[PDB]
Amino acid sequence: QAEEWYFGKITRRESERLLLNPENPRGTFLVRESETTKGAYCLSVSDFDNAKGLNVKHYKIRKLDSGGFYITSRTQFSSLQQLVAYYSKHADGLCHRLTNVCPTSK
Known part of the structure; x- marks a missing residue:
């Protein structure tokens, strides 16, 4: 299952689309x-x-x-969730803090 942020081993091209x-x-x-x-x-x-x-x-x-x-x-962070959750508020290194997760339609 693609749990919100964790889509899985999706390739770059799939992700870009x-x-x-x-x-x-x-x-x-x-x-x-x-x-x-x-x-x-x-x-x-x-x-x-x-x-x-x-x-x-x-x-x-x-x-x-x-x-x-x-x-x-x-x-x-010792977990992916712990990472995204924090980076959602404090971007720290990113130019923009994690606001919304990529919507899928399948």
């Missing part, structure tokens, strides 16, 4: 499991600039072997 919906607001995020980089996730957020348009910013979720998950060497 979902994120690049003009009806998506800035802050649309989701975490994919990278098969092209095993042991790593990707919190991909859809940004919006009135000069670039809707642009998907692929942040990388690195794994600590004695810690958990972290997108940047600042905030580190």
Whole structure:
């Protein structure tokens, strides 16, 4: 099951098709499991600039072997939920805090 943020091992192209919906607001995020980089996730957020348009910013979720998950060497969480939940309020490294999760239709 794609639990809100955790869509699973969806490839970049599949994710882009979902994120690049003009009806998506800035802050649309989701975490994919990278098969092209095993042991790593990707919190991909859809940004919006009135000069670039809707642009998907692929942040990388690195794994600590004695810690958990972290997108940047600042905030580190022992679970994916713990990560997104915090980054929803404090972007910390992202340009925009996690606002809404990418909507699917299947």
